Design a protein around this nucleic acid. Structure first.
Ligand SMILES: Nc1ncnc2c1ncn2[C@@H]1O[C@H](COP(=O)(O)OP(=O)(O)O)[C@@H](O)[C@H]1O
Ligand code: SF4
Ligand code: SF4
Ligand SMILES: [Mg+2]
Ligand SMILES: [Zn+2]
Lengths: 63, 57, 416, 194
RNA sequence: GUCUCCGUAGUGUAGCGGUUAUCACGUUCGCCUAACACGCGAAAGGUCCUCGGUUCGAAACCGGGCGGAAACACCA
RNA sequence: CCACUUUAAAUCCUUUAACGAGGAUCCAUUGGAGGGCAAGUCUGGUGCCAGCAGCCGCGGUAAUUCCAGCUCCAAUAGCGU
RNA sequence: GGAAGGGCACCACCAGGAGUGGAGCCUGCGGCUUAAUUUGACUCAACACGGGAAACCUCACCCGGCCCGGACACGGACAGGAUUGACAGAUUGAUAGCUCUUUCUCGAUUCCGUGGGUGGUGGUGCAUGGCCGUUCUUAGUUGGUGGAGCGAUUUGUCUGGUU
RNA sequence: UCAAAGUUUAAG
């Protein structure tokens, strides 16, 4: 079982749940403002250029 | 021919084990009593095709 | 070329080391060796019979594997038409190894050097003892056989029995049947005889010398009739050749029929040559210690340091030596170091935690040191000298000084 | 049949000033063995004459000339009558004092002459190279030595020593010559001796 | 030094200027045998020691080369 | 361990006061445990090796025979060679 | 048994036939070769045999890559969400979210030990079962009681004819 | 009313 040096293992992922996640803001105490855009058909996230979903897998980008 | 090499091969690589503890065993007459008592009085049961004083299944 | 020969020797050493380790099941392996003079047909017949005998071996696993091993060697021998010079060596088998990999294997090769050893063996391992013995004994010896009939010159490795050159001569009669002429004929007879000795000596210079320095490490004169004596104690015989004359052997017979006789009688004296060279070497090393000098060094911790620096002239080692060069490596930081460890310090050692960082410093596997010396003594100063434990000075060097040291090219100071 | 004896001159051996030394230059210690034991601390260096080669290196290194290594025959190891410390002097046998006969020791100094005189006086118990009186008497059987020591041990024989060093006597005793003789009378034979 | 002869498949030998270079063994390949041996059937293999000549043609006839082996070396 | 006795003088036994047992202590051993032949088809290691075995034998990767642990057997201040 | 008596079989012979052995190819096998050319079986009783005419699958072999289909428990792990499952684009054979990058998710799955499973066309048919095959397709094999022998054994189960 | 027919792992 001589494992080759340059091949090595391929590490799997490690998630990072960065505490409680925020998607809203408090406007005048009573009312609320939403930060990120939502699905049409659930927040479609802000990719650096794209707008990618996290469930139904829909995608968008304003050129 | 044949080398005097392996000399104490098996004595060497055997797995060493501690010799346990139990009791100061009975000696002299007392021992003989005890062995008399465990042939002739304690057990003396209904037979089931012969006995075995160090039996093990 | 000399360098190409050295590479081929190393390749075959490596090959032998791999074969020794092999191992397998029952008696599956087929260590086979053939001497150079031998006929291949004769070996092919032998193997065929051995195949026939194997064809009733009660076991399953053993039998089939052996048949297929003998089948393979027979096929290898069909590829040759003659046993090549140097002999042949054939190693067939069905080796077990890691990963449960029962792999078949066949290594025929014409070995470096003429070997004189036949061998057939079946076993669980390969029998590479004969080869290792031929690799060790590089000391060639020379053999001059004098006789009134005719001479012979030959050489002798541990096993191998060579014939270099020979001639015969039409020498005159012992007596002259005239009163006055008896004296003159006698003087003429002694001149003819001296010219024969002179001719022999010249032929010895031609043969045994190589680049104005004798190739043979020994030189046996054999024969009878105080003729070999005339050769050793004579001014015609060159001193550089004469200085290495080790025996004068009284034999019966003459020529090739006596050559083997002369070897048998001379065998004890020939084996002792290596032992004498050791005594001289270690004796020279221990001279430096007896006087102040400070050329000498000893122990891996010092001798290697000396070798790295202002180098050694001669590096002297025991044959066997335990000590081993490991390569230690770090998990996180990728820092590494190499150390030369004893049998107890190498087997189990809690030293090798990284400490400064705070991790387990894993010891990646060794290359054994004496082999290490052999690999790159050319890199350092040179003249790697292995010595035994047999001589009284040698036993001191092994037992006392740890079987490792060196005679240095100049004076060196040490500390700690 | 030859063995070796290490000797450390305790007056000269000062382990603090020199450093460790011996260890560093000894080929048995550089191998990794207990041939020499020193450290910067502790007094005097110890050497195992078992493990010692007798290479003659440590003597050349040591800065004071503290160390010596000699060769003694292996026959003598059985017949050791005294050894005070490790890496020190080793006396073999004792002279055989005979009653009513004046024993004449002859031999150069520094060859265990004083220690023998002390043993025979009865000051020093023969440690016998161990470093016991029934064991000592059994060692000395078949010879007048066991007679001598048995005489010493129950009948308290009085050991008296005319000393070597005469110039140290004036700076100890006081008074006239006649007064000291008068004080030390037991036989009462001043005049005849005088 | 002389005179003589012989150098032919792996081995030992035949060979009368025009030969597929003879025979035996060895070798390989079948078969036979459980296998082997023997046996049977097939096959492969010559720098004809080396060079030059004579010859329409030379393995041979002739010359020299390199090897090998017998006999002679006597009268003082 | 006081004392007596003993004894040529002692010792030892004997006599006798005073201290003197929870077994972790005041600790029983030597050889065996396939057959002959009393007593394990127990568990771990080795793999025709190391070794045992007076004899027959056991050992070549499920050793009742090897080295170990456990249990058991024989005799027991003894028991082996 | 290259001993003697019977008596029998075209896997024996005879008398014949059809051949095979020679040719080409089909295929099995051994060898060589190869990363790998997977493997069992070698006298009848191995070799167009494994129902074995494999493109893939089959598939074990080799060289690449995913996945867990790692049960349960004891615990640690419990929410400042343990840490199952992801379009990019680089990479990759791949439109394997396999990885690096970057948004989000079942929400009680997890990860780590230990016990321990589980799988395996891995090893062992000289550890076995079952099933075949063969000895051995011939006429053979058996005990009770009695008889003969110290007994192993033998008789029955046979001189002869008959099938 | 008698031709020839030799041998069989060390690998349990
Ligand atoms: N009490 C002691 N401790 C350590 N060493 C000693 C002692 N006495 C003497 N020596 C050493 O022994 C050596 C010789 O002393 P000693 O034997 O008394 O002399 P001699 O040999 O003349 O009889 C001295 O050199 C000294 O170093
Ligand atoms: S003499 Fe004995 S001790 Fe002194 S150095 Fe040489 S070996 Fe070490
Ligand atoms: S021996 Fe000389 S060197 Fe070694 S310690 Fe004693 S003094 Fe220092
Ligand atoms: Mg027994
Ligand atoms: Zn969506």
């Amino acid at each position: 079982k001589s494992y080759t040096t340059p091949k090595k293992n391929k590490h799997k992922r490690k998630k990072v749940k960065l505490a409680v996640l925020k998607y809203y803001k408090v406007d005048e105490n009573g009312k609320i403002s939403r930060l990120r855009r939502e699905c049409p058909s659930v927040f479609m996230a802000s990719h650096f250029d794209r707008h990618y979903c996290g469930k139904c897998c829909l995608t968008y980008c304003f050129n | 021919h044949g080398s005097l090499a392996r000399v104490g091969k098996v004595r060497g690589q055997t797995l060493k084990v501690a010799k346990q503890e139990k009791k100061k065993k009975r000696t002299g007459r007392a021992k003989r009593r005890m062995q008399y008592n465990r042939r002739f009085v304690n057990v003396v049961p209904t037979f089931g095709k012969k006995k075995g004083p160090n039996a093990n299944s | 070329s000399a360098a190409d020969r050295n590479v081929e020797i190393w390749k075959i050493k490596k090959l032998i080391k791999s074969l020794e380790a092999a191992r397998g099941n029952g008696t599956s392996m087929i260590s086979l060796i053939i001497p150079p003079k031998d006929q291949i047909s004769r070996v092919a017949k032998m193997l065929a019979d051995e195949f026939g005998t194997a064809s009733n071996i009660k076991s399953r696993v053993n039998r089939l594997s052996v048949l297929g091993a003998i089948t393979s060697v027979q096929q290898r021998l069909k590829l040759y038409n003659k046993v090549p010079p140097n002999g042949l060596v054939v190693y067939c088998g069905t080796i077990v190894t890691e990963e449960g990999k029962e792999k078949k294997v066949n290594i025929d090769f014409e070995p470096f050097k003429p070997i004189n050893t036949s061998l057939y063996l079946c076993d669980n391992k390969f029998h590479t003892e004969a080869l290792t013995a031929l690799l060790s004994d590089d000391s060639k010896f020379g053999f001059i056989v004098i006789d009134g009939s005719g001479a012979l010159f030959g050489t002798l490795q541990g096993n191998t029995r060579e014939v270099l050159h020979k001639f015969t001569v039409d020498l005159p009669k012992k007596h002259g049947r005239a009163a006055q002429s008896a004296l003159r004929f006698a003087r003429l007879r002694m001149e003819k005889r001296h010219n024969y000795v002179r001719k022999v000596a010249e032929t010895a210079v031609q043969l045994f010398i190589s680049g104005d320095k004798v190739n043979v490490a020994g030189l046996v004169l054999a024969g009878s009739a105080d003729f070999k004596t005339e050769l050793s104690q004579s001014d015609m015989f060159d001193q550089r050749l004469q200085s290495k004359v080790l025996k004068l052997v009284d034999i019966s017979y003459g020529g090739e029929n006596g050559f083997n006789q002369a070897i048998e009688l001379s065998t004890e004296v020939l084996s002792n040559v290596k032992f004498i060279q050791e005594k001289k070497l270690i004796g020279r090393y221990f001279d430096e210690i007896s006087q102040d000098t400070g050329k000498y060094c000893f122990g891996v911790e010092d001798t290697l340091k000396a070798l790295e620096m202002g180098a050694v002239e001669i590096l002297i080692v025991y044959e066997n030596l335990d000590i081993m060069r490991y390569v230690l490596h770090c998990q996180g930081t990728e820092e590494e170091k190499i150390l030369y460890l004893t049998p107890e310090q190498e087997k189990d050692k809690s030293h090798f935690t990284d400490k400064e960082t705070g991790q387990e410093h894993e010891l990646i596997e060794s290359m054994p040191l004496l082999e290490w010396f052999a690999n790159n003594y050319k890199k350092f100063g040179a003249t790697l000298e292995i010595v035994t434990d047999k001589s009284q000075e040698g036993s001191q060097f092994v037992k006392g000084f740890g079987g490792i040291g060196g005679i240095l090219r100049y004076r060196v100071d040490f500390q700690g | 049949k030859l063995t070796r004896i290490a000797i450390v001159n305790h007056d000269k051996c000062k382990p603090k000033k020199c450093r460790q030394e011996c260890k560093k230059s000894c080929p048995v210690v550089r191998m990794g063995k207990l041939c020499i034991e020193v450290t910067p601390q502790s007094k005097i260096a110890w050497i195992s004459e078992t493990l010692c080669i007798g290479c003659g290196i440590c003597i050349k290194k040591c800065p004071f000339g503290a160390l010596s290594i000699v060769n003694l025959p292996s026959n003598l190891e059985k017949e050791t009558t005294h050894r005070y410390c490790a890496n020190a002097f080793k006396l073999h046998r004792l002279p055989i004092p005979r009653p009513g006969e004046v024993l004449g020791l002859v031999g150069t100094n520094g060859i265990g002459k004083s220690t023998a005189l002390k043993i025979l006086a009865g000051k020093q118990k023969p440690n016998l190279g161990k470093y016991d009186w029934q064991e000592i008497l059994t060692y000395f059987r078949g010879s007048e030595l066991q007679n001598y020591f048995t005489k010493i041990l129950e009948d308290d024989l009085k050991a008296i020593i005319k000393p070597q060093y005469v110039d140290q006597i004036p700076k100890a005793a006081k008074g006239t010559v006649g007064s000291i003789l008068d004080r030390k009378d037991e036989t009462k034979t001043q005049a005849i001796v005088c």
